[PDB]
Structure formats: structure tokens, C-alpha cells
């Protein structure tokens, strides 16, 4: 039975200590400020960050002129720059370890829609993205955790078929017009 060969994986991990106030409050700060739906969204960002940090630490352990260090360091730095996760002049691979989960959270399409105007709020931005209302280059994206790249940050705008940047009105805007007539 082929299709048994399709891979799949886990994206987050629960905390070792269930109830500690300090972590609880620190996590709720982020879940509120960035308008996330639950702790799992924060924990998957942490897990992705821990992956990239283990890679960076391994490459930093080796010695320069090691072609693995060279090749993978250039690739990892390019990946970090491509998503705006790293300022200019920072391509030293020690500034990857300094990178924070707030930086990943800052690149989600929810946060960028809020930060670009268009939203008036962080929760308005989410409900705006999950209602087919926002496009990136030409495509209607409705996943708030899209993680835009720095190149495509310019072309974000409203959809051509949402009332707020497109064409025809919605259910209720038409419904009131018909009952009015």
C-alpha cells in the first residue's frame, strides 16, 4: 500500500513544567499582543526557532574553512535574510543565535496586515485574513500564519473580490438593499 510512504511530523512540543507563573505570563503576553489563538501557535514558533538555533550552534562549533560550515552558513543566512529575520550587515551567523521568537511572530501575515494599516486591530486583522479578504502577490491567502518574505512585503493588498479592496458587496450589504427596495 503506497501512500504509507508519505512523511509527516510534529511541529510543537508541550512545556516540561505545566504550571509555572513566570512562563505562563510571559506566554500570555505574546498570545495577546500578537493576537494568537492558543498556546500551540507560540510553541510551534519556539520549536522552529530551536531547530534553526541547533543548526546554527552546530555550524558555529566547527572551524571556518570547513566547507560544510561555509555552504550551510551561507544558506542559513540567506534563509534568515529572505524572511527579514535579520538586519543588514548581520551575516555573521552569530547573530542568528541572538534571534528571538518575537522576530518570527513579527512576520506573520496577521502582524504585517495590522502594521500596514488595513486592519485597525490585531484581531480585526486575523478575521480579515480568514475571510478571503487579502492577497499577497495575486493569490487569496487565508492562513494568518503565512510568514511573508521581505520581497513580497510590498505586494500585499486587499483581494480583488472582497468589498474592502475589490468588487461586489457582501451578504448583508445586498440583503439590506433588497429589503429596502
Instruction: Give residues in contact with other proteins (CB under 8 A).
Output: 1-3, 5-6, 25, 28-29, 31-33, 35-38, 67, 70-71, 74-75, 123, 126, 132, 135, 139-141, 160-161
| Count of other CB atoms within 10 angstroms of residue 120 | 10
Nearest Cα residue to 27 out of 51, 11, 10, 44: 44
Give 77 or 108: the residue with its C-beta nearer to RNA: 108
Site map 107..126 versus RNA, x via CB under 7 A: -------------xx-xx-x
User: What is the total count of residues that contact RNA (CB under 7 A)?
Assistant: 50
Q: Examine residue 87 and tell whether it contacts RNA (CB under 7 A).
A: no
Angle at which helices 39-61 and 21-33 cross, to 10°: 100
Three-state DSSP class for residue 47: helix
Instruction: Report the residue from 68, 92, 115, 130 that binds RNA according to the rule CB under 7 A.
Output: 130
Q: Examine residue 149 and tell whether it contacts RNA (CB under 7 A).
A: no
- Alpha-helical (H) ranges within 100-158 are 101-105, 109-115, 122-129
CA-only gyration radius of the chain, Å: 21
Distance (Å, rounded) from C-alpha 156 to C-alpha 67?
38
Q: Examine residue 92 and tell whether it contacts RNA (CB under 7 A).
A: no
Within residues 20-59, the interface with RNA by CB under 7 A covers: 20-21, 24, 27-28, 37-41, 44
Q: Examine residue 2 and tell whether it contacts RNA (CB under 7 A).
A: yes
Nearest Cα residue to 38 out of 147, 144, 113: 144
Grid cell for residue 167: 468588487
Task: List contacts with RNA (CB under 7 A).
Answer: 1-5, 8-12, 18-21, 24, 27-28, 37-41, 44, 120-121, 123-124, 126-127, 130-133, 140, 143-145, 161-164, 169-176, 178
Amino acid at each position: 500500500h503506497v501512500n504509507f510512504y508519505r512523511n509527516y511530523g510534529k511541529t510543537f512540543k508541550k512545556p516540561r513544567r505545566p504550571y509555572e507563573k513566570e512562563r505562563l505570563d510571559a506566554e500570555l503576553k505574546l498570545v495577546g499582543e500578537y493576537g494568537l489563538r492558543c498556546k500551540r501557535e507560540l510553541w510551534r514558533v519556539q520549536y522552529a526557532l530551536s531547530r534553526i538555533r541547533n543548526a546554527a550552534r552546530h555550524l558555529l562549533t566547527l572551524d571556518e574553512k570547513n566547507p560544510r560550515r561555509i555552504f550551510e552558513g551561507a544558506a542559513l543566512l540567506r534563509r534568515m535574510n529572505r524572511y527579514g529575520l535579520l538586519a543588514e550587515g548581520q551575516d555573521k551567523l552569530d547573530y542568528v543565535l541572538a534571534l528571538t521568537a518575537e522576530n518570527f511572530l513579527a512576520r506573520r501575515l496577521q502582524t504585517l496586515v495590522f502594521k500596514a494599516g488595513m486592519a485597525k486591530s490585531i484581531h480585526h486583522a486575523r478575521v480579515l485574513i480568514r475571510q478571503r479578504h487579502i492577497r499577497v502577490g495575486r493569490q487569496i491567502v487565508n492562513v494568518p500564519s503565512f510568514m511573508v518574505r521581505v520581497e513580497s512585503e510590498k505586494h500585499i493588498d486587499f483581494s480583488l473580490t472582497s468589498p474592502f479592496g475589490g468588487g461586489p458587496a457582501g451578504r448583508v450589504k445586498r440583503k439590506n438593499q433588497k429589503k429596502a427596495s
